[PDB]
Design a protein around this nucleic acid. Structure first.
Lengths: 73, 110, 249, 110, 214, 87, 36, 92, 87
RNA sequence: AUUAAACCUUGUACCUUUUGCAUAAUGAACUAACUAGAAAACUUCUAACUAAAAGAAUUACAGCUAGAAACCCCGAAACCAAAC
């Protein structure tokens, strides 16, 4: 068959049921909330528009964060 | 599609003229297209064969063929080469003769 | 139709009687046996309209002569095909029918031919040109969808500096043209053909024919920044002062 | 509480006094009592057509087919339509009553 | 009192109107109560049976889905075996389908297999009466009953038709070519004919849709 | 086991053919066999010969003493051909 | 599923042959064509 | 060899509800004011309802539609099968 | 038999449940909410004031207008300079 | 053919392949089952409608829409990854 919930939703189900549900709400909120780390090695694009090469028209742009590896140390 | 508006003087400045009234009492009646135009289309097949097709043929198709053959025989110089699709009620003629046929159809009052 | 007399005599048809038309299906070759055994974007894509077609549209009554010619009405009448995917940017006019199109009516076209302008003006028609943003024009052709989205009417855009000279040109009769030159310009066009210029003011419906929207205004009927109560068949106008400042901005 | 009436045959033979029944029907249905050129009278009137056709069908016992219904524009068509006999006899039934020769044997096993 | 019906739309002058006998199901002998007119452009179209043939094939084959599958040698832990679920759905032009439906109506009318009725209401709900009435009027073994809308169809007719396999009760929107051919004779209410005529007649002057009909 | 009914039906005919060949049935008179009408055959018999026969007399000639006994035996649970035979 | 009848068609013409030819379809078929 | 026994007799009813009601509402779009397109009446696998394509297209569409819900074993097998299919059609 | 009731599309606004995980994100966006308003207008219940840009949005919108969309006077200046350069 | 099973008369096994030739050469104890051509971009043909066609995204100076019409099998020496 096929799983009704994708793999990423499997973790959510465990968090919502069992001992995870019994966990303190404050701790659950801390786990649930995600805050983006402050950029260090990458800066956001200065311009918000650029000329699309394919159609030759101005298009919106996106920011790609630089990959950085943080060792366990 | 709105029906054509009544005009004080026919033909219209563009040149369109509605079917003549009263309609002819011939065995075969030719109805106009949805756009109120004569159902005559110039067609070319195989890249070398020019053709003209009449679609909205009603009544006795054989009678129409005889008259069409008679009308086109002098102008063409011989009996026209035609193919009759009775099932679809359409007539196929080799060559481009829409202008003469269109004028001739107006004479009939269609 | 003697064929019908054949039908009445013939017996009732059944499901099995169905038979494919002659030559409808071709044969195929199967491998069962030995038979098969062995072995440019910057330039606006102006879309033209023939005056003979315009006469055809007018003569057939496809577009109401009383109402001034509107590009949206032409779309509603299926006069021309405009595809946003084609990235059509403009609409133009055609000189065809110059000698077989005798009529006078007010019209607005993104682009107009100099020769055609005088001919229609000679009959007494009013011709002007307005600039619609290709994105905005697509909205203009299909107003209902953005109402479904809930978007409000935006202010009409202005041409890029490349196309400003054309619209600003008095002879082009653009909305950016100086009105002061129009009385002089119309005489010059009349002089070119030599026809006696018929003053538009003389016309009883002069105000209706000469009515024009603001450059910011997309629609004659509707001012920019307006909203429509499509569910209630009513028009909603913003009452916020800041919104008026936004429209001014 | 509703009981089906017996099935009726579709076989009709022109009456010997065909005109008598026809004229009597018109004499009653039509107030003018069979006026001049009754044969050429038009049936376009809905009320008259229903009364005349229904009355004739009940009195005569033969009814105009729906496919043939529109053809009954004039009384002449009705008179001609009724005078042609209609037989329900099957082809086998006709063969049985056709002076079967001694050497020919027919048995209906259905 | 004859019930006289005329076509709501303008019939062409060069084409004469079509007519048929109006019937009622209230009584066994209530065969003829009125006269109705039918549009020639709908009920007097040309007999083009290939379109009907084409429509029938589309009807049968557009719902066809094959789920047969087999493992090839590479998939073993068949040289030419079935490969997964396959569907045969396709769409015929809706103008042809409308044209095909028009042809079918003419065939039933010209063949005296179509029976126009004022209403489907029946004095009794007994399925026997419906079969009994069909025999008296020489209807075919299979009879199709059509009503304007499903919600308002009479209970008595539903009970009679529900218990009869060869007599099927369908709404106007459910009408199709296959059922008409499958059923020997067709019974149509007067409102249904007008409803069918409007849609079929509306097919003319078909402005190509610039947006979804919804 | 191959599916289908036509193949099974064909084999049944094959079995019947072998049975008939191996064991031909005992002879039986056409009178017992179906589609026999004594009156019809006699009329055809006379016409085929292009000769006129008196049906009553012809029946007596065909009638035999042995046949009567069989019918009489069944009856227990008519003119012989001797006179015509002598002539 | 009727391959047996195809064999019978060859067999009826090859019943009078001698040796394994009369009973082998591979050989029986060839002989019948040559005989014809 | 061939059967020596008769198959069970079978009689099929052509007027059963399924056959009798087959095809009803096939004209829903034209007869329903086009509120419901006939494609909406298609019942089958989600990735091919109202859509048709070749075997490669059908498999690819299946992967996208239920890739998140597909088994790892099935997903791995599908990728391997797709690779073979891709090479054959696009190079031979 | 009697045919089943015809299938019918459910009319009227339908509000997805935000908490449900299964509901797609795009169905919970303000654009979806704006779409609901257009379909049913007042029946949707969307506040009309929310449809117009928020004051923070208003400030953002003006930024692009100045940044990307010059006014007529600015072009008129550019034309004069370009004409002078061409001259 | 024959009255007659054999005699008399006529006739250089088969598949593939070589030259369109084998008295070459391959392959076959025999029986049963299994065992190898698959795709629509365009064209012709079949129809719908037509300066328009298509149930949204396509093409159009008779086109446009739908249908139908097509391209095998078995078999290496190898190469690489991960185990044993």
């Amino acid at each position: 068959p096929l799983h009704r919930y994708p793999v990423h939703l499997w973790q959510k189900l465990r968090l919502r049921q069992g001992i995870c549900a019994r966990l303190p709400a404050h701790f659950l909120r801390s786990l649930e909330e995600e805050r983006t780390p402050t950029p260090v090695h990458y800066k956001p694009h200065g311009t918000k528009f650029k000329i699309n090469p394919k159609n030759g028209q101005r298009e919106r742009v996106e920011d790609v964060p630089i990959p950085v590896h943080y060792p366990p140390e | 599609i709105p029906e054509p508006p009544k005009h004080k003087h026919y033909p219209t400045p563009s040149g369109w003229q509605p079917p003549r009234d009263p309609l002819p009492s011939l065995p075969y009646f030719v109805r106009r297209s949805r756009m109120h135009n004569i159902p005559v289309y110039k067609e070319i097949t195989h890249g070398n064969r020019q053709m003209t097709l009449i679609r909205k043929v009603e009544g006795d198709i054989w009678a129409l063929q005889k008259d069409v053959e008679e009308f086109l025989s002098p102008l063409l110089g011989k009996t026209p080469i035609t193919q009759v699709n009775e099932v679809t009620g359409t007539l196929r003629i080799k060559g481009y003769f829409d202008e003469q046929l269109k004028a001739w159809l107006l004479e009939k009052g269609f | 139709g003697t064929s019908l007399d054949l039908l009445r005599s013939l017996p009732r048809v059944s499901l099995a009687n169905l038979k494919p038309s002659p030559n409808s299906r071709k044969r195929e070759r199967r491998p069962r046996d030995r038979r098969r055994g062995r072995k440019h974007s910057f330039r606006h894509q102006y879309q033209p309209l023939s005056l003979r077609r315009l006469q055809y549209l007018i003569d057939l009554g496809r577009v109401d002569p009383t109402q001034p010619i509107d590009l949206t009405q032409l779309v509603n009448g299926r006069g021309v095909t405009i595809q946003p995917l084609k990235r059509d940017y403009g609409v133009q006019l055609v000189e065809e029918g110059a000698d077989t199109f005798q009529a006078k009516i007010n019209i607005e076209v993104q682009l107009a031919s100099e020769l055609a302008i005088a001919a229609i003006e000679k009959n007494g028609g009013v011709v002007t040109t307005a600039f619609y943003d290709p994105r905005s024009l697509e909205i203009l052709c299909k107003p209902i969808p953005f109402f479904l989205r809930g978007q409000p009417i935006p202010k009409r855009m202005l041409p890029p500096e490349s196309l400003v000279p054309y619209y600003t040109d008095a002879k082009n009769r653009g909305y950016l043209a100086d009105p002061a030159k129009f009385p002089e310009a119309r005489l010059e066009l009349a002089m070119k053909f030599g026809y006696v210029l018929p003053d538009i003011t003389k016309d009883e419906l002069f105000r209706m024919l000469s009515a024009r929207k603001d450059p910011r205004q997309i629609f004659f009927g509707l001012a920019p920044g307006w909203v429509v109560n499509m569910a209630d068949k009513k028009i909603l106008k913003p009452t916020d002062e800041n919104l008026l400042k936004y429209y001014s901005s | 509480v509703l009981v089906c009436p017996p099935l009726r045959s579709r076989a009709y033979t022109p009456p010997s006094d065909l005109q008598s029944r026809l004229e009597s029907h018109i004499k009653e249905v039509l107030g003018s009592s069979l006026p001049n050129n009754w044969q050429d009278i038009s049936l376009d009137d809905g009320h008259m057509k229903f009364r005349l056709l229904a009355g004739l069908a009940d009195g005569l016992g033969h009814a105009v087919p729906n496919s043939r219904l529109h053809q009954m524009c004039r009384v002449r068509d009705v008179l001609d339509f009724y005078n042609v006999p209609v037989q329900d006899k099957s082809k086998f039934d006709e063969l049985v009553a056709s002076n079967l020769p001694p050497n020919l044997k027919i048995s209906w096993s259905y | 009192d004859p019930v006289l019906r005329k076509c709501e739309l303008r019939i062409p002058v060069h084409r004469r109107p079509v007519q048929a006998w109006v019937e009622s199901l209230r009584g066994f002998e209530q065969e003829r109560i009125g006269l109705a007119e039918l549009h020639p452009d709908v009920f007097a179209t040309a007999p083009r049976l290939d379109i009907v043939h084409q429509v029938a094939i589309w009807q049968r084959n557009f719902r066809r889905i094959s789920y047969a599958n087999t493992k090839t040698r590479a998939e073993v832990s068949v040289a030419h075996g079935p490969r997964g679920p396959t569907s045969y759905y396709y769409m015929l032009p809706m103008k042809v389908r409308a044209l095909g439906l028009k042809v079918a109506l003419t065939v039933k009318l010209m063949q005296d297999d179509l029976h126009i009725v004022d209403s489907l209401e029946l004095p009794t709900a007994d399925p026997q009466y419906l079969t009994e009435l069909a025999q008296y009027r020489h209807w075919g073994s299979s009879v199709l009953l059509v009503d304007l809308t499903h919600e308002e169809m009479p209970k008595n007719v539903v009970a009679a038709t529900s218990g009869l396999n060869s007599f099927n009760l369908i709404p106007a929107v459910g009408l199709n070519v296959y059922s008409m051919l499958k059923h020997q004779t067709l019974v149509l209410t007067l409102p249904s004919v007008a409803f069918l005529e409007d849609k079929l007649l509306w097919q003319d002057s078909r402005y190509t849709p610039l947006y979804p009909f919804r | 086991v191959k599916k289908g009914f036509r193949a099974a039906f064909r084999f049944q005919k094959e079995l019947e053919r072998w049975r008939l060949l191996r064991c031909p049935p005992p002879p039986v008179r056409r009178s017992e066999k179906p589609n026999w009408d004594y009156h019809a055959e006699v009329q055809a018999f006379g016409s085929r010969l292009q000769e006129t026969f008196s049906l009553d007399l012809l029946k007596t000639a065909f009638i035999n003493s042995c046949y009567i006994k069989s019918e009489e035996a069944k009856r227990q649970s008519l003119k012989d051909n001797q006179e015509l035979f002598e002539q | 599923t009727d391959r047996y009848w195809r064999v019978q068609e060859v067999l009826k013409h090859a019943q009078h042959f001698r040796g394994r030819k009369n009973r082998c379809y591979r050989l029986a078929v060839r002989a019948v064509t040559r005989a014809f | 060899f061939v059967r020596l026994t008769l198959p069970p007799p079978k009689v099929v009813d052509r007027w059963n509800e399924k056959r009798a009601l087959f095809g009803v509402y096939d004209n829903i779009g034209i007869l329903g004011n086009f509120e419901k397109h006939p494609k909406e009446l298609i019942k089958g696998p989600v990735w091919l309802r109202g859509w048709r394509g070749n075997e490669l297209q059908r498999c690819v569409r299946k992967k996208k539609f239920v890739g998140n819900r597909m088994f790892i074993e099935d997903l791995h097998n599908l990728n391997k099968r797709i690779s073979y299919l891709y090479k054959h059609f696009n190079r031979h | 038999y009697r045919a089943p009731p015809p299938p019918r599309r459910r009319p009227g606004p339908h509000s997805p449940d935000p908490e449900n995980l299964l509901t797609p994100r795009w169905q919970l966006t303000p654009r979806y909410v704006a779409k609901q308003f257009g379909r049913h207008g007042a029946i949707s219940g969307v506040p009309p004031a929310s449809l117009w840009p928020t004051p923070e949005q208003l400030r953002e919108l003006e930024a692009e207008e100045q940044e990307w969309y010059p006014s007529l006077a600015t072009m008129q200046e550019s034309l004069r300079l370009q004409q002078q350069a061409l001259e």
